[PDB]
């Protein structure tokens, strides 16, 4: 069996847990959205290869600088998230999450994911940001960040609609195999 390890990193409530739930289930939590995602092995196929992809959440670990690294050893691929509806989350990619991921996982492929893509055109969202002289992150901004951090690839999805979720993990699995 080809066994690979994935750890998802990023700011809190940029929907890490929710992203992992829809992928592993192939469905968005309809009646109730869980807070808890346990360490879980997803079966995923790419380029003709069956892969056991171990999924690790870090939701809850954002404030504990010495509990976080515990999840890092033996990682095969890092899913670094920001939320398109929070340009704060994006500035935090170069500022917090990549120096940390590059320190504890040297040479491990990183894929950059902008979640909540379904909020680039939300009117309610647009207003809130225009308050603090901000706006939903543009595709080129996410792709430019992706080039600057030396990411394997850049991806966007919406956990709500499921759009891009499958492809997110497909990409992450190819990166793990590289």
């Amino acid at each position: 069996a080809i066994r690979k390890k994935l750890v998802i990193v990023g700011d809190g409530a940029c929907g890490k847990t929710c992203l992992l739930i829809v992928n592993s289930k192939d469905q968005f939590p309809e009646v109730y959205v869980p807070t808890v995602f346990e360490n879980y092995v997803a079966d995923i196929e790419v380029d003709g290869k069956q892969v056991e992809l171990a999924l690790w959440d870090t939701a809850g670990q954002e404030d504990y600088d010495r509990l976080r690294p515990l999840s890092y050893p033996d990682t095969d691929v890092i899913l670094m998230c920001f939320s398109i509806d929070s340009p704060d989350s994006l500035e935090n990619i170069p500022e917090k999450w990549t120096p940390e991921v590059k320190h504890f996982c040297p040479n491990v492929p990183i894929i950059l994911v902008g979640n909540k893509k379904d909020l680039r055109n939300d009117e309610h969202t647009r207003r809130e940001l225009a308050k603090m002289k901000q706006e939903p992150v543009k595709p080129e901004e996410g792709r430019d960040m992706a080039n600057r951090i030396g990411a394997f690839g850049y991806m966007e999805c919406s956990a709500k609609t499921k759009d891009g979720v499958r492809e997110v993990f497909e990409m992450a699995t190819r990166a793990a195999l590289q």
Binding site: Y32, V36, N39, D63, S71, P73, E95
Partner: protein, 355 residues
């Protein structure tokens, strides 16, 4: 699956959306507590008890891998039984803050943080040892692949499963925050859940600090062995001679990492620097040795420096000695990135204020 569709099938039709959402979050907490207990019992049955009874490693190494597994199990099992006791009195859970405070507040907090810290603090070290052992000892590698092939490991390895205590602890504030969200405010119930959540964060801060100091100690012990203070016992300046017997083991580490030393006329030095409580130590990595060598001192006392960010260079920063004995010495140091410079500055300034 779901609270709605199982327990309280006839009794869901009466409640508000907020009381449903509240029942769902309580149920998820209950269910994931049973699920954590089941994982801890995998660790016990498949790994710990067999490793012990079959003598796969010395008791002393085993005690450092599973220091207190039975106490960890009971800390969760008793909380779990109390959960079961509440579920019995009716499928709609009423007040839950007492049950929370009975785990995360007062003596119950002290116990839980003690036990969780004992279990986790040394774990990263113990797992490196098990990696080495797996690689060097075929009976141990065989045992590990035999054990890990058990259906209850759910295709995960010991090193995947053993981290669940720490991961479980980080869930509690999230779960509580989510119970608070669907609790009618102005209630004592709300006020006590808020207390319990604030106490969990404190417990996590405690476990964080425990892993930190245990790892840091072990790191420093290893650096001391590699520490070479040859060129300093005779040296070139008495600004350096007192650190001929440095001993990194008597100090506490705040930070560490690679820095570039812009020392001369387009001449640099790749260093490994340790930010200790009292001292900033500059070391040269030969490959498997750490060199204390001088001209500049390699050790800077933090009480007698200032930190200045460089105007034109977003990666660099200055460390200026303020001691009248210690000539016009500015140390120019370059961080990896601008972000690296940020955190290096923030910690240097903090440490200096406290020095």
């Amino acid at each position: 699956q779901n609270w709605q569709h199982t327990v309280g099938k006839d009794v869901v039709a009466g409640l508000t959306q907020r009381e449903i959402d509240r029942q769902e979050v309580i149920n998820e907490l209950f269910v994931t507590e049973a699920s954590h207990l089941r994982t801890l019992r995998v660790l016990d049955l498949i790994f710990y008890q067999r490793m012990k009874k079959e003598n796969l490693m010395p008791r002393e190494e085993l005690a450092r891998l599973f220091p207190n597994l039975p106490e960890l199990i009971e800390i969760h099992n008793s909380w779990c039984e109390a959960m079961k006791k509440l579920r019995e009195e009716g499928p709609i859970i009423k007040e839950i803050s007492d049950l929370m405070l009975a785990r995360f507040d007062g003596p119950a907090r002290e116990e839980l943080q003690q036990v969780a810290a004992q279990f986790c603090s040394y774990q990263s070290i113990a797992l490196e040892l098990i990696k080495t052992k797996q690689r060097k000892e075929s009976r141990f590698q065989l045992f590990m692949q035999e054990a890990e092939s058990h259906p209850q490991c759910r295709r995960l390895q010991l090193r995947d499963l053993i981290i669940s205590e720490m991961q479980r602890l980080t869930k509690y504030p999230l779960l509580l925050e989510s119970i608070i969200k669907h609790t009618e405010g102005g209630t004592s119930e709300h006020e006590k859940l808020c207390r319990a959540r604030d106490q969990c964060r404190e417990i996590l801060k405690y476990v964080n600090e425990a892993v930190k100091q245990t790892e840091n100690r072990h790191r420093l012990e290893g650096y001391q062995k590699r520490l070479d203070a040859t060129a300093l016992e005779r040296a070139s300046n008495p600004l350096a001679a007192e650190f001929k017997s440095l001993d990194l083991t008597t100090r506490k580490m705040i930070h560490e990492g690679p820095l570039t030393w812009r020392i001369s006329k387009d001449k640099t030095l790749d260093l490994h620097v340790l930010l200790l409580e009292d001292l900033l130590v500059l070391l040269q990595k030969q490959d498997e040795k750490l060199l204390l060598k001088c001209t500049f001192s390699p050790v800077l006392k933090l009480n007698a420096v200032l930190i200045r960010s460089v105007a034109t260079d977003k990666r660099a920063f200055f460390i200026i000695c303020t001691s009248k004995l210690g000539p016009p010495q500015i140390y120019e140091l370059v961080a990896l990135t601008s972000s690296d410079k940020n955190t290096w500055m923030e910690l240097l300034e903090e440490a200096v204020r406290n020095a």
